[PDB]
Design a protein around this ligand. Structure first.
Ligand SMILES: O=C(O)c1ccc(-c2oc3c(Cl)cc(Cl)cc3c(=O)c2O)cc1
Ligand SMILES: [Cl-]
Ligand SMILES: [Cl-]
Length: 330
């Protein structure tokens, strides 16, 4: 018959037990700040269609970033706003400083705190072993928090992690694909970015949960400790799953498909072939060896699992010995 149902193994009913207005974002009444408090300074690079700007709050001369939204997507705008408000003040979550609009045209915009980011393409080349452990821990604080608040981020990738490296200051940004978790809901699998899509998205398993974000995090960890960005580089979504299978092996993939009674698109079996699981040690070479340890490999192995229920939760990840020296520091 159809696929086996699944529910999250942590934070399952957080939204069930909240007041409706916590998660019923279409009902939210937006409290608007004053557009004339902000002046746009320079456009930032956020992709071809983005409208994201460095700006200044002219009442205090603090730098901010403004994201101008397209008003056509009313329900999606309210969802992002409600999620940002629900999570504001949480650890390592970007702060929504304001929400403003043109008073006449009503074009709305989100105003974020400024982080003095170093582009990850440059930054990740310079990070030490300790730095990777530290910033992974910071991202885990943000994911445990938002998952505990009933929210899946669904677009975890380096481009959505702002790092002010000299202040060791990290923020998880771009909550525009984030969604409230409700057990049994069949979600859109056209989320995340190709290289960070979990197997559930690539095989069209819609009843996914917070654990999708842990697969994306494991992709980032692998790219950082092995200096291979992105780590799984498919040319489309089908080839993306082949790239994962050439590392994790095809047997555990077919085991996952069988466990959830997933109907695999039939061209897949041709291109997936037959691949053994590769020992993680195989990806260590001369330029990344100083970033790899037995603890890092054990931790990565526990995030990058086909079965979403078998991946570490963010809190379980924070307990892993990979972070022992970070935890003492904090
Ligand atoms: O879509 C969003 O949620 C969102 C949120 C924040 C930012 C954001 O981007 C920055 C970029 Cl790209 C460069 C630099 Cl140097 C600083 C920032 C920054 O301070 C900042 O807040 C972008 C998009
Ligand atoms: Cl969805
Ligand atoms: Cl979690």
């Amino acid at each position: 018959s159809g696929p086996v149902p699944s529910r999250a193994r942590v934070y399952t009913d957080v939204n069930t037990h909240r007041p409706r207005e916590y998660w019923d974002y279409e009902s939210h009444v937006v409290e608007w700040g004053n557009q004339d408090d902000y002046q746009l300074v320079r456009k930032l690079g956020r992709g071809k269609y983005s409208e994201v700007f460095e700006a200044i709050n002219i009442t205090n001369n603090e730098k901010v970033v403004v994201k101008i939204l397209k008003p056509v997507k009313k329900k999606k705008i309210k969802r992002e706003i409600k999620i940002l408000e629900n999570l504001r003040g949480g650890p390592n979550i970007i702060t929504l400083a304001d929400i403003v609009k043109d008073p006449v045209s009503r074009t709305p915009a989100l105003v974020f705190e400024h982080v003095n980011n170093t582009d990850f393409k440059q930054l990740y080349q310079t990070l030490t072993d300790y730095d990777i452990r530290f910033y992974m821990y910071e991202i885990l604080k943000a994911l445990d928090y938002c998952h505990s608040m009933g929210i899946m981020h669904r677009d975890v990738k380096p481009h959505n992690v702002m790092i002010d490296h000299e202040h060791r200051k990290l923020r998880l940004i771009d909550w525009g694909l984030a969604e409230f978790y409700h057990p049994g809901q069949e979600y859109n699998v056209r989320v995340a970015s190709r290289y960070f899509k979990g197997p559930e998205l690539l095989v069209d398993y819609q009843m996914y949960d917070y654990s999708l974000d842990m697969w994306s995090l494991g992709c980032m960890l692998a790219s950082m400790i092995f200096r291979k960005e992105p780590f799984f580089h498919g040319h489309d979504n089908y080839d993306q799953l082949v790239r994962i299978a050439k590392v994790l092996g095809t047997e555990d993939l077919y085991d996952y498909i069988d466990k959830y009674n997933i109907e695999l698109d039939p061209r897949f079996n041709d291109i997936l072939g037959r691949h053994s699981r590769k020992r993680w040690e195989r990806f260590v070479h001369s330029e990344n060896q100083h970033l790899v340890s037995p603890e890092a490999l054990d931790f990565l192995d526990k995030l990058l699992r086909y079965d979403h229920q078998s991946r570490l939760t963010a809190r379980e990840a924070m307990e892993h010995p990979y972070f022992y020296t970070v935890v003492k520091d904090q």
